[PDB]
Amino acid sequence: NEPPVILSMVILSLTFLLGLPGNGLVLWVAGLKMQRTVNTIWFLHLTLADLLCCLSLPFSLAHLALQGQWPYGRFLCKLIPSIIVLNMFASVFLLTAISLDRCLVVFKPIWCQNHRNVGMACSICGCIWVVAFVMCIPVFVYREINRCGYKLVAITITRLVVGFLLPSVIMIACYSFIVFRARRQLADLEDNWETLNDNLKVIEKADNAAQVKDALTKMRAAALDAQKAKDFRHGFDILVGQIDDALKLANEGKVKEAQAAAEQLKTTRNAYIQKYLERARSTLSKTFRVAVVVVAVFLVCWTPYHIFGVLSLLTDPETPLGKTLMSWDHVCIALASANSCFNPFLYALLGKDFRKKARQSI
Amino acid sequence: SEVQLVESGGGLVQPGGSLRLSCAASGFNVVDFSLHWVRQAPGKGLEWVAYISSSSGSTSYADSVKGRFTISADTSKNTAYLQMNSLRAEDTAVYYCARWGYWPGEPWWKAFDYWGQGTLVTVSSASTKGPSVFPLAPSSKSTSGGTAALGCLVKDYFPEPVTVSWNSGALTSGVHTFPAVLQSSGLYSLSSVVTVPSSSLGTQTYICNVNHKPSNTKVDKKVEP
Amino acid sequence: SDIQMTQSPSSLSASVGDRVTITCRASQSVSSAVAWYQQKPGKAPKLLIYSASSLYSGVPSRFSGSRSGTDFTLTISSLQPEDFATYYCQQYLYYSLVTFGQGTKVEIKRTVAAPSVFIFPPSDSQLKSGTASVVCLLNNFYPREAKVQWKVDNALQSGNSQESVTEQDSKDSTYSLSSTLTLSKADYEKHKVYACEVTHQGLSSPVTKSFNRG
Ligand SMILES: Cc1cc(C(c2ccc(Cl)cc2)c2ccc(Cl)cc2)sc1C(=O)N[C@@H](CCCN=C(N)N)C(=O)O
């Protein structure tokens, strides 16, 4: 009995029990009900990787319960950890590719509209699986049995380089760029709303036609700018039409009628502009929270594993520090495998249409 | 046929007075597209003149033409009219008619998809006098080898177009025709020159036949060294 | 006040196949309400790009437009012998807010050439009519950037003379220039020597063409 061993067993059991049925249901809904799109392919691949990773959790529990003693042949001892590493690398690369695609669809929309299809998604998923198998090959090669394991530095170095540094950096950069672009769009919308409001504040008490028409032209320019940021388009068209009517009324020397037409804009403003501004703010808050939670979960799940993998080479196993690292390696791998259960709750279960399909499925 | 716009108010006027420019559309209805006017001075850029709305009644004019011009439209024959009064030397340009659409739709964001033929409106401030032709030959010596030059200069003619040809077209390689220039008095000058080796000067003569189309002036000027 | 528009590339030279960039700036926010037009000498203008983002039908895909804040950029990838004309920019934010730019002209580059400068004095008919006119001809110059002056009896003269220049030569794509100055009979007979100086860039020194009266 050992507290780290019991903790690892409990974490693995909870991960399995919370991941297997959920991932199974998500995969079933995405395969049998959801239409065949690119995001559907990504979700299917992620759920398949998570299911293949969770199916070996009983084997990990059986191995840990025997206190390392593996009576089976060398075949399983070389196969199952290689399969675990394969699933982990596949999931990491799939998440990185999903982040890259979500960044590219906002960065260059024309290139994605003209090139992004299902064939490219299948090809990049195949390339991801090939790279994962290449990274898994040395695990299956160097593993040997009784205690299943090894008897190494460059392997851990290239693993930290390819599987942890570059994917995490790419994901962080993509999420940061998306957040910055969304915040810039919200700032532009808020500036347009402020230019619409501050000039009406003086139009409501103006006493000259030149300032009125200048402020109305500024309002029209701000509305045309915000239109490129559905009932939204109809409301902006009505707003621009009423602004044009106010301009036509002001050019004829009617200052009071122009002020009345400008004050009439408050109805459609409070009807459409405020509602859509609140909707955009809520959407930005939601996507920012989602990105932050995903990044935090990925870091918490994949940082201690690589930290301990690096420290294993800089610490002698005979020293008490090496024994402590070897004992907590189980907890580290359990926390890393918990990401396989945390994946569907942060990628697939957030879509509104997907949530509705999953609810109607039950 | 496609969208076409034709003008019929081209001509010359006096300082002030009055003029009426017409704009006829073909291929579409004027009840649904707004008609505007754009000036273009010879050798200058474009400039907006006025705007008339057929289905709205609202009119608009440039800051430099307020209180002097008037614009209207007729949906019976689908024809726009521009009455100009108190014209000055600044209004001498080629007027172009265009059509910009309505905000509820895509044609609004579209540019001037169809331009008119263009109507030339110039202020005369003078009368027709008739061009005078004068030869241009080297004074005493050139010594340039087989690259000589001889020309004819027409001067003091009010209308713009003028025809000139060497030997009724027998000599064409090297005939350079330069655009007319406006003088301070109101007349124009044009020079038509040609280059020929000196070996041909001592063998055959040259005549610069110049005819004025807006008048009945034909001159056959001989050029000899 | 009216929304001003400034167009810095008034005239630029390029060759066939090279790219052309035209920049434009507005006074305030226009929201991509700027379109481009192409006009040939002696013909009506025609649109090529509207809203700086969409290409109009029938226009070749070589032209492209981009917008950055209040700045607009028109890009031509490869020139063709059929698109050498003038380019204008128009703001169409509203019916009463139409404003045009200064215009952008394009020309074809050529090799080095020396202009054969000639001078022609007034004839006998000029003296009989009472007014004389002396002209100067510059035949072939590629850059179209040159200065020509008149030495009237060891004295420079300007302002009274008038110059013209032809453009878009169909034969050699070069340019020709014609200067002319007119004076009275008593103002011309009082002098004996005249000259014309040319300071063309393609020449190592200003070339002078002179003649002695009588
Ligand atoms: C990912 C993974 C999962 C493994 C299995 C397992 C072990 C044995 C057998 Cl027979 C069957 C399954 C397992 C997981 C959890 C628990 Cl509680 C018990 C067992 S082994 C393994 C792996 O790749 N180890 C590498 C790197 C470790 C270095 N330390 C770092 N990087 N922090 C190595 O050995 O060098």
Numbering used by the authors:
A (entry chain A): 19 to 163, 170 to 175, 333 to 410, 426 to 558
B (entry chain D): 3 to 227
C (entry chain C): 1 to 214
The authors write:
Activation of the complement cascade produces anaphylatoxins like C3a and C5a, which regulate inflammatory and immune responses via their respective G protein-coupled receptors (GPCRs).
To further explore the interaction between JR14a and C3aR, we conducted structural analysis of C3aR bound to JR14a, both with and without the heterotrimeric Gi protein. This complex structure was resolved at 3.0 Å. It adopts a “λ“-shaped configuration within the orthosteric binding pocket of C3aR, with a buried surface area of 577 Å2, which is considerably smaller than that of polypeptide agonists. Unlike C3a, JR14a occupies an additional minor pocket in the C3aR among TM1, TM2 and TM7.
